[PDB]
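Reagents: none. Just compute today. RNA-directed RNA polymerase NS5.
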Amino acid sequence: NMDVIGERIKRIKEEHNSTWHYDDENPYKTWAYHGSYEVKATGSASSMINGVVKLLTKPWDVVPMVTQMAMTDTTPFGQQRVFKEKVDTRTPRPLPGTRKVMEITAEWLWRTLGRNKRPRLCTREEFTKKVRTNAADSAKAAVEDEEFWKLVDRERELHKLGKCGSCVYNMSRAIWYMWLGVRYLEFEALGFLNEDHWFSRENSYSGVEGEGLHKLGYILRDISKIPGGAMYADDTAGWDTRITEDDLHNEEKIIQQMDPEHRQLANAIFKLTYQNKVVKVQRPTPTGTVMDIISRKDQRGSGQVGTYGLNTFTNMEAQLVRQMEGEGVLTKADLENPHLLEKKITQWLETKGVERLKRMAISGDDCVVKPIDDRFANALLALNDMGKVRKDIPQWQPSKGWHDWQQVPFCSHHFHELIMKDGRKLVVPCRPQDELIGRARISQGAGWSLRETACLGKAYAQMWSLMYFHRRDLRLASNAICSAVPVHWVPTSRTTWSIHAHHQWMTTEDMLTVWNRVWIEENPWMEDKTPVTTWENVPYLGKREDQWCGSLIGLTSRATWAQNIPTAIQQVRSLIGNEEFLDYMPSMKRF
Ligand SMILES: O=C(O)Cc1cc(CC(=O)O)cc(-c2ccccc2)c1
Ligand SMILES: O=C(O)Cc1cc(CC(=O)O)cc(-c2ccccc2)c1
Ligand SMILES: [Zn+2]
Ligand SMILES: [Zn+2]
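Predicted 3D structure written out:
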């Protein structure tokens, strides 16, 4: 293995030879440990509170999930405890027959995914435009510097030679250029999967990339119309740790559809950075803090460019195999068989594959499957064998499906069908309200002015206006936050990193206008394009469901908060100062 990772280690060794040592009391058991060097401690056990959001959500000061979220350990200590739990494990190798089905399926799936599209290289200008639009920190400074691009070019020349010298994953500009240069080279070779929407619903049938949270529920409702069994949504315990060498070799098959110059660069990314990796991990010691240099041949690097698309791909493949087992196409004898006949797998893929893909909604490790009947619940031999062991359930207990698409969990959410006063139906995203309020009350990082804090608060309030307007508490808090923040202040910083976020709330444009555009105008499931002229016509969940999903409506503390919210708004305003404010409270029935 040192023939592939050695050059990278040699450069880390030399760059930090002042503090380089082999700590013989390191915790790594499955990962290969190379050495350590001293560093300053990064992250805290707590997180900065958004005072604007906190001031306008007083009843949630006494809510356990809200308090819990105000913590989250990002220190070298917290990073080490989470590591040994899942990261430091080995997945048993799938059986020869299972490996054969996976290979047949992967081949078929890559050819289906590339039927209309062709792989291509992504560019310096695409990555530059991306780093610009996302920042508008030290990434934009590197992108604007020609010396960064000269180093990228040097690293690329090693890749074309089949060598790597600076592509290191993490769990000032010297190493920062080597990291951002590694991410650019990965984007150049594999970015087309994201950039050209290989996992969009139209291209992949199962995929949902580029659809958006507001479309996921409509997608789940459409799957529920397909005849078959219950809807299954099993979670895998630590998906990224369960990605085997066999999975990596099946994902690699996309290189076969590439142009020679592209194939050469993607093959270098796969073989030198996915199938062989050098990882930097922060660890505390009695002498201080160190950065450990570790390596392994399998698992997925969680923050990489290809990660989402490749997990979506491998999950679609795994779910097709489980459907095949559910249908009796694959038996126990077949999975053990090193000479299993391809014919029946190919036959099933060629005649039923696409129809079977349409029964699923897959986003990385998140899946929803509506098989042709419920034999799927007990079809576990292949799923467990492939290494995709389901979370918090005995390996062999049958899965439990849902007979109502509204009860189905997907991408940290569930979805409700709402009937508007005008009789039109909406399908909306929802989740427990404490998770929503608890996140909104946290400001990412430290050293933030009341200005930046108020704008992030406005960002969260406008996100709730567009996605979670059907929650009474969130509509009230959203109107209170927007009443307290000056009108012309542009929401800055993101509310979420979700690939399902289109950030339509990052504007000073009227939120009812934006709501109309998302839910009425551009909504393919909204046949009647009549606009909603008032927030009073934007529906709420029924009171009961609002309560079942964490609402405080009906509580005295909540009625006291609602009645006295203009006072709290006025307090934030007096602290912000002499700015122009709009009172958004009259857009509500209450005021
Ligand atoms: O990132 C977070 O803090 C929580 C979170 C999670 C998810 C689900 C997932 O991507 O895993 C989705 C969204 C989201 C919200 C509004 C619009 C679009 C997406 C937010
Ligand atoms: O049900 C509706 O359509 C109208 C509606 C709106 C609101 C939002 C607001 O807080 O002003 C709250 C409540 C509510 C119900 C029971 C107890 C406490 C509040 C009802
Ligand atoms: Zn490299
Ligand atoms: Zn709900």
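Residues 155, 159, 164, 166-167, 182 surround zinc ion (ligand 3) (CB under 6 Å).
Action item: order primers for follow-up constructs.
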